[PDB]
């Protein structure tokens, strides 16, 4: 189970400026799905270290030897940058230069090393099948393989004496892969619309996106940096994780751009004819085009400021030039609506020197 | 490149069951290495990725839910369905369906999306009225003008104008919730004062809860 804080969560800043949006990993510790892959891993190294223990003897006195092969310079490499391709090379290695040698001896033997080899196997498809983990995308097996061919026959008893170390560095690189997310990726939305892929692999920009964007991070702290932030940028920012099951989100960045203060022009509209047929009568006041988006709208009925019988709406930022459009609708029975003369919309605005109001007669 | 459509009620009861349906097209789930999610979003919250499926059908569940969700596939109609069983209030999402790949473990195409509502509430059509412009909603060389969408249950509903003909300057107001029960938005346009006398506006709203269609001409 994989959560994202995403920060910050809101975030307003001006055309040309630098944002960046930073999602942190949290990890919490979870047969032939990729849900319970990870989990299971304990169980399969829990299988190797039982059919290993029962040939441990056989194979540590057979190799009469003391220089140790599997060297810690194998788990440097394990844990390294290249540690993926080191990890197969050892599984290969051990699947195709040891094990078809050494499994021919007793029955019991070799019920055993076939089970060993049977569960690398295994264990290779899985990989290659979830969160891709195989294929990949080092001096150390270089060292190990030139060791084994010195050894001769004599190289076999030795790898095999040394499995329970190998076990353990497969432990180890995928105690490390768990505790991590592999990649990173980012997605916009504009409001009403569905999200679009904007950041895959951590770093990678997709299709339509421009070099304004760029992905950074790894192991647990990742981030998304617009480096010229334009009017088109606002949007909501999520992170996405598909490295483990189930797939989550960050909480989102919510992203409006700054602008020079514009004011609001005004309109109102009386009620229509055939509402008013109906009973009810709703008096429509329009603040077009104006930022800021705080406005403060009133509604005045022969003088009497109103409350409770109106409802705001207001726009999304404009996607071009960054400014909102508000309406305020009072609601009104008929009968009520005809009891007065005078309806007013007040609005005040920091682009508005004083307030502006719009009336009209019954 | 690839696209998908969802499908599927617009209003559902409680503790009934929700069945959801994705069509795509330009890629095929007997593809080895396709996958097909579904991911929802309530209103004002977070995406929440729900489950998916894969050409070997190989399935997978959100456990914040599970018990509650099946999906399955049909790769000759090319075709995914959710089922939510006992739906809740606080499952009213609109729901995506998104295409991902062994090579990705990331959808890299959604869906438009279908927005789904749990209510004991029946459907209802809306009323549809004429904003119109006079001197009161005229500013320079423009005047506004609109339509007013009352009353309505549940989400959505479209509004366009002329059929389509007139585009710019088009604010439709996100809905609001009404003490009612019932939603409500309007439709405004600005348009050249100098055409008031001379163009005719209609507009078109489509609330396809409730099979409703209305044309509202709006004049002076």
């Known amino acids: 189970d994989i959560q994202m804080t995403q920060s910050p969560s809101t975030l307003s800043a001006s055309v040309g400026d630098r944002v960046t949006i930073t999602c942190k990993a949290q990890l919490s510790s979870p047969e032939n799905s990729c849900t319970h892959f990870p989990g299971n891993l304990p169980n399969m190294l829990r299988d190797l270290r039982d059919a290993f223990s029962r040939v441990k003897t056989f194979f540590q006195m057979k190799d009469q030897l003391d220089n140790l092969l599997l060297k810690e310079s194998l788990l440097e490499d394990f844990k390294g940058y290249l540690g993926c391709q080191a990890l197969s090379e050892m599984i290969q290695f051990y699947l195709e230069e040891v094990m078809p040698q050494a499994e021919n001896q007793d029955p019991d033997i070799k019920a055993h090393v076939n089970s060993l080899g049977e569960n690398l196997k295994t264990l290779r498809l899985r990989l290659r099948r979830c969160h891709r983990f195989l294929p990949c995308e080092s001096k150390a097996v270089e060292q190990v393989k030139n060791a084994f061919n010195k050894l001769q026959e004599k190289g076999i008893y030795k790898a095999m004496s040394e499995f329970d170390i190998f076990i353990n560095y497969i432990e180890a690189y995928m105690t490390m892969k768990i505790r991590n997310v592999g990649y990173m990726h980012w997605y916009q939305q504009k409001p009403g619309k569905a999200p679009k892929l904007l950041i895959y692999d951590t770093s990678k920009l997709a299709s339509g996106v421009p070099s304004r964007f760029s992905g950074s991070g790894s192991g647990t702290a990742f981030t998304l940096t617009i480096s010229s932030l334009q009017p088109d940028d606002f949007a909501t920012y999520y992170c996405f994780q598909g490295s483990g099951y189930p797939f989550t989100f960050g909480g989102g960045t919510k992203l409006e751009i700054k602008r020079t203060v514009a004011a609001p022009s005004v309109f109102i509209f009386p009620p229509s004819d055939e509402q008013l047929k109906s009973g009810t009568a709703s008096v429509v006041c329009l603040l077009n085009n104006f930022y800021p988006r705080e406005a403060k709208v009133q509604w005045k009925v022969d003088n009497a400021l109103q409350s409770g019988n109106s409802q705001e709406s207001v726009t999304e930022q404009d996607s071009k030039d960054s400014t909102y459009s508000l309406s305020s609708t009072l609601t009104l029975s008929k009968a009520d609506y005809e009891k007065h003369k005078v309806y007013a919309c007040e609005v005040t605005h920091q682009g508005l020197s004083s307030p502006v109001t719009k009336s009209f007669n019954r | 490149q690839v696209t998908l459509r969802e499908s599927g009620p617009a209003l559902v009861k409680p503790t009934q069951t929700l069945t959801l349906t994705c069509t795509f097209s330009?890629?095929?789930?007997?593809?080895?290495?396709?996958?097909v999610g579904w991911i929802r979003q309530p209103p004002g919250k977070a995406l929440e990725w729900l489950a998916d499926?894969?050409?070997?059908?190989?399935?997978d569940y959100n456990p914040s839910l599970k018990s509650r969700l099946t999906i399955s596939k049909d790769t000759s109609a090319n075709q995914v369905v959710l089922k939510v069983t006992n739906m809740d209030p606080a499952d009213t999402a609109t729901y995506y369906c998104?295409?991902?790949?062994?090579?990705?473990?990331?959808?890299?195409?959604w869906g438009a999306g279908t927005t789904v509502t749990v209510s004991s509430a029946s459907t209802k059509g809306p009323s549809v009225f004429p904003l119109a412009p006079s001197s009161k909603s005229t500013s320079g060389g423009t005047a506004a003008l609109g339509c007013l969408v009352k009353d309505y249950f549940p989400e959505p509903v479209t509004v366009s104008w002329n059929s389509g003909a007139l585009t710019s300057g088009v604010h439709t107001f996100p809905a609001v919730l009404q003490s009612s029960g019932l939603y409500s938005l309007s439709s405004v346009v600005t348009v050249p004062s100098s055409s008031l006398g001379t163009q005719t506006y209609i507009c078109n709203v489509n609330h396809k809860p409730s099979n409703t269609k209305v044309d509202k001409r709006v004049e002076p």
């Open positions: 499926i894969w050409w070997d059908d190989k399935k």
């Open positions: 998104a295409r991902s790949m062994i090579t990705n473990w990331y959808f890299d195409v």
């Open positions: 330009g890629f095929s789930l007997s593809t080895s290495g396709m996958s």
